[PDB]
Design an enzyme around this catalytic site. Structure first.
Site, PDB file in Angstrom:
ATOM      1  N   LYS B 187       0.821  -1.202   0.000  1.00  0.00           N
ATOM      2  CA  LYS B 187       0.000   0.000   0.000  1.00  0.00           C
ATOM      3  C   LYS B 187       0.856   1.254   0.000  1.00  0.00           C
ATOM      4  O   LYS B 187       0.368   2.325  -0.369  1.00  0.00           O
ATOM      5  CB  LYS B 187      -0.932   0.032   1.212  1.00  0.00           C
ATOM      6  CG  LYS B 187      -2.057  -0.978   1.198  1.00  0.00           C
ATOM      7  CD  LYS B 187      -2.914  -0.858  -0.019  1.00  0.00           C
ATOM      8  CE  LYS B 187      -3.954  -1.941  -0.037  1.00  0.00           C
ATOM      9  NZ  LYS B 187      -4.848  -1.788  -1.206  1.00  0.00           N
ATOM     10  N   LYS B 188       2.114   1.143   0.420  1.00  0.00           N
ATOM     11  CA  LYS B 188       3.053   2.251   0.451  1.00  0.00           C
ATOM     12  C   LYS B 188       3.909   2.330  -0.801  1.00  0.00           C
ATOM     13  O   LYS B 188       4.898   3.067  -0.815  1.00  0.00           O
ATOM     14  CB  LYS B 188       3.945   2.146   1.686  1.00  0.00           C
ATOM     15  CG  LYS B 188       3.236   2.503   2.961  1.00  0.00           C
ATOM     16  CD  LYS B 188       4.026   2.095   4.174  1.00  0.00           C
ATOM     17  CE  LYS B 188       3.355   2.606   5.430  1.00  0.00           C
ATOM     18  NZ  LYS B 188       1.877   2.469   5.346  1.00  0.00           N
ATOM     19  N   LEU B 189       3.561   1.589  -1.846  1.00  0.00           N
ATOM     20  CA  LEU B 189       4.157   1.779  -3.159  1.00  0.00           C
ATOM     21  C   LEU B 189       3.384   2.789  -3.991  1.00  0.00           C
ATOM     22  O   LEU B 189       3.650   2.921  -5.189  1.00  0.00           O
ATOM     23  CB  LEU B 189       4.245   0.447  -3.906  1.00  0.00           C
ATOM     24  CG  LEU B 189       5.298  -0.541  -3.412  1.00  0.00           C
ATOM     25  CD1 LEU B 189       5.006  -1.918  -3.948  1.00  0.00           C
ATOM     26  CD2 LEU B 189       6.680  -0.096  -3.829  1.00  0.00           C
TER      27      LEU B 189
END
Ligand SMILES: CCCCCCCC/C=C\CCCCCCCC(=O)O[C@@H](COC(=O)CCCCCCCCCCCCCCC)COP(=O)([O-])OCC[N+](C)(C)C
Ligand SMILES: *[C@@H]1O[C@H](CO)[C@@H](O[C@@H]2O[C@H](CO)[C@@H](O)[C@H](O)[C@H]2NC(C)=O)[C@H](O)[C@H]1NC(C)=O
Ligand SMILES: CC(C)CCC[C@@H](C)[C@H]1CC[C@H]2[C@@H]3CC=C4C[C@@H](O)CC[C@]4(C)[C@H]3CC[C@]12C
Ligand SMILES: *[C@@H]1O[C@H](CO)[C@@H](O)[C@H](O)[C@H]1NC(C)=O
Ligand SMILES: *[C@@H]1O[C@H](CO)[C@@H](O)[C@H](O)[C@H]1NC(C)=O
Lengths: 42, 663
Positions: B187-189
């Site tokens: 999700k933090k890409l």
């Protein structure tokens, strides 16, 4: 009443919130009388 | 005995059939590491109930006789009376107490699970990624044999005392914490995270101080916060799993959760994820620390003996019964839907907005941060046509409804039945909400012309009245900070992007002398309502606006136009042209106490520095003492109201002031 605003304060555009961290909750519309209704004169 | 058997704990012959997978997942394991997590989760849920579940603020939230717009997930979920919601919270407290002690553990798990998920689904605005997780960890632990070690169920029942647990009680718990970590790492890409935009303020905390010695603070926020939280969340469940890299992985995820315990106020998330990371260790590790203590101490500790056999496992010589096949099914099915629900957003498209899906179940913590400029809620009476304006937050106990189209349809429906108590017969309510996500242009998130009371929302259709997030104006964000840095201490700026055909009716207050609008991109036409005069601007043209009067910014471009409001508050400027004139004559009458109420606040915010740490901490335990005492005494008021009945109001008043006493 206190549930409304005029057309000078509702039209003022000028006057970081992450959704993860966990207060007011007593600045409601009819709070202080519905509190004393269910509780005593606190 | 193979290379893969020492590495993963099993070979591919254990996955050769369904019977060999049931046998692998019900393999007899030491109960000890599962039953220290049962204590440390059930003890951090005993603390969580008066603090974050809202037991101490239950009288202010679920009060009877209160006009309130509530946001449950299922709209048929109505909350109980306040006297009975104090019983739901004391059943949930006995459930978290019997899960902590292990006292009647199957009964005490459903005494915690059932009123937690009742309270959790009763408010969509209280959903976090941790309050969702605590209801997931308590859901798994209902089926796990966590009372098989260090419990009073061991003392009462002799066959639950120090007995084997199946392997699937760890493969679900390790598989959950791997899913919490790794799915948060992808999700933090997002482009808001790998470019350093979400949590851009976070490196200014004092806990990122040693990273400033080698890097700049512009690069501390990019590497340590954004790429350091990416490459930890991506590779925490890979480091914790394997034996060669666990002690390197246990140190990096202990530091990552001792930082987040102070960087954010997220409840017990940093202590539940700290108590969960030893599930990846060898399951004998409580017995390996029991043996390291002095010799007569372990009769207060649990037993250090080898575990006795159990009925719940599959042993070697045994055909696996129906219980053992329900543990290899609960492991594969639940760790499938735990991998699917963070990406189930193509299914529930009615919950989809600028960010995908409803908040809470997708493990995208801190990836999207918002800042609201303006909420204008406009009702319209049904039998007259009086165009009137509501307060922005009237009956809500939260501010999360302005981001989510499912909650705005709930707020517009709840306002349609509450406003006839204030002489609005059947309203037509229009929401004009300006949000900018991750320092972007401020734009409307919902269409301001759609009547949200009669607008169509369904959970599986993409909503018609949600404005798209203009991501082709996301290159502009480097230029917007260049304009914000170009301004002095006095002038503020509001960057605004508007859609074709829409306009913004702003009332510049009379305090904002010398305000002006400069068009950055597109083509707007600024109308002055008091003069009824238009003026078409193109890219780069400034225009001064009057104070105290109305002006409208009509977008006349076929593309979305972008502009900015470079205003200065000349009222508080002239206030500090007099108060900074007043202080220099002090070291030689409405305005004199406004100077003194600011010299008042200068006294106590400075002794925030001058207070010691040990009395800071002593006051924090006093606060905690009062939030655990009020939640206990206001429960006994409402637990007497159901058994003994409700007394007179003067005797109810004497107890609530007694409950609200600072200790
Ligand atoms: C690359 C993928 C890395 C991914 C990491 C995922 C973590 C999930 C942990 C699952 C697990 O513990 O395996 C358990 C069973 O494993 C099985 O039963 C077979 C798999 C069935 C599905 C279980 C979810 C996968 C093994 O039990 P263990 O003996 O206790 O663990 C191995 C011992 N060790 C940790 C020292 C190596
Ligand atoms: C200034 O220009 C704006 C932009 O065209 C005018 O707004 C239009 O007003 C008419 C009548 O009220 C509406 O039918 C149009 O839909 C409006 N345009 C848009 C884009 O919404 C405005 O009337 C002009 N004012 C003056 C005094 O000339
Ligand atoms: C109505 C009162 C009695 C409360 C009843 C509790 C019910 C509604 C709760 C208890 C356990 C809950 C489940 C626990 C775990 C999950 C996995 C999660 O990823 C999606 C929701 C889901 C599948 C929950 C659905 C709702 C659920 C079934
Ligand atoms: C208004 O503020 C801007 C901000 O830089 C400044 O350039 C301008 O001179 C000001 N105008 C007046 C009349 O104060
Ligand atoms: C300008 O400053 C004053 C303080 O003197 C404040 O009351 C007012 O709200 C400010 N103006 C705006 C638009 O916020």
């Amino acid at each position: 009443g206190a549930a409304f605003v005029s057309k000078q304060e509702g039209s003022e555009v000028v006057k970081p919130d992450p959704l993860e961290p966990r207060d007011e909750l007593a600045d409601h519309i009819g709070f202080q009388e519905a509190y004393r209704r269910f509780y005593g004169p606190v | 005995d193979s290379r893969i058997g020492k590495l993963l704990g099993f070979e591919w012959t254990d996955l050769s059939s369904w019977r060999r997978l049931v046998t692998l997942l019900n393999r007899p394991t030491d109960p000890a590491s599962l039953a220290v997590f049962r204590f440390l989760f059930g003890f951090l849920m005993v603390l969580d109930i008066p603090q974050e579940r809202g037991l101490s603020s239950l009288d202010r939230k679920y009060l009877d006789g209160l006009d309130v717009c509530r946001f449950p997930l299922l709209d048929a979920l109505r909350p109980l009376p306040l006297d009975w919601m104090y019983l739901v919270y004391t059943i949930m407290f006995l459930g978290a107490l019997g899960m902590m002690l292990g006292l009647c553990y199957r009964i005490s798990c459903v005494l915690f699970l059932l009123p937690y998920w009742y309270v959790f689904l009763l408010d969509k605005t209280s959903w976090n990624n941790h309050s969702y997780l605590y209801g997931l960890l308590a859901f798994q632990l209902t089926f796990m044999d966590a009372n098989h070690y260090w419990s009073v169920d061991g003392l009462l029942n002799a066959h639950r005392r120090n007995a084997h647990v199946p392997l699937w009680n760890y493969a679900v718990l390790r598989g959950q914490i791997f899913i919490v970590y790794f799915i948060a790492g992808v999700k933090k890409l997002d482009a808001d995270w790998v470019e350093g935009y979400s949590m851009e303020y976070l490196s200014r905390h004092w806990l990122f101080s040693p990273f400033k010695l080698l890097l700049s603070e512009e690069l501390t926020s990019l590497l340590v916060v954004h790429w350091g939280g990416l490459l930890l969340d991506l590779s925490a469940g890979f480091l914790l799993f394997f034996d060669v890299s666990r002690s390197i992985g246990l140190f990096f995820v202990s530091y990552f959760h001792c930082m987040n315990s102070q960087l954010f106020s997220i409840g017990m998330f940093s202590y539940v994820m700290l108590a969960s990371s030893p599930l990846f260790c060898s399951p004998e590790w409580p017995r390996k620390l029991v043996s390291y203590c002095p010799r007569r101490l372990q009769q207060l500790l649990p037993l250090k003996a080898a575990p006795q056999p159990s009925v719940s496992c599959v042993y070697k010589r045994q055909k696996p019964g129906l219980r053992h096949q329900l543990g290899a099914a609960f492991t594969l099915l639940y760790l499938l839907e735990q991998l699917f629900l963070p990406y189930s957003h193509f299914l529930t498209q009615g919950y989809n907005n600028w960010t995908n899906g409803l908040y809470g179940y997708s493990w995208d913590m801190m990836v999207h941060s918002r800042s609201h400029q303006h909420v204008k809620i406009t009702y319209r009476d049904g039998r007259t046509g009086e165009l009137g304006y509501l307060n922005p937050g009237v009956f809500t106990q939260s501010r999360r409804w302005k981001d989510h189209a499912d909650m705005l349809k709930q707020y517009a429906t709840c306002l349609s039945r509450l406003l006839p108590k204030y002489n609005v017969t059947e309203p037509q309510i229009y929401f004009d909400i300006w949000v900018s996500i991750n320092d972007r242009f401020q734009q409307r998130i919902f269409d301001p012309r759609v009547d949200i009371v009669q607008a169509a929302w369904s959970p599986f259709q993409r909503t018609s009245w949600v404005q798209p997030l203009l991501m082709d104006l996301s290159p502009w964000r480097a230029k917007l900070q260049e304009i914000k840095s170009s301004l002095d201490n006095h002038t503020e700026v509001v960057f605004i992007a508007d859609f074709p055909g829409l306009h913004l009716e702003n009332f510049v207050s009379e305090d904002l002398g010398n305000t002006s609008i400069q068009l950055l991109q597109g083509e707007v036409t600024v109308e002055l309502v008091a003069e009824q005069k238009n003026q078409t601007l193109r890219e780069g043209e400034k225009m001064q606006l009057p104070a105290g009067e109305y002006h409208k910014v009509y977008t006349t471009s076929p593309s979305p136009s972008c502009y900015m409001y470079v205003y200065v508050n000349t009222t508080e400027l002239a206030l500090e042209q007099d108060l900074a004139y007043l202080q220099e004559l002090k070291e030689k009458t409405p305005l004199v106490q406004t100077f003194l109420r600011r010299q008042q606040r200068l006294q106590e915010i400075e002794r925030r520095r001058n207070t010691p740490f040990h009395e800071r901490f002593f006051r924090f335990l006093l606060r905690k003492l009062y939030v655990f005492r009020r939640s206990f005494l206001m429960t006994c008021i409402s637990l007497r109201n159901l058994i003994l009945g409700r007394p007179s109001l003067e005797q109810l008043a004497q107890e609530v002031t007694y409950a609200n006493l600072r200790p």
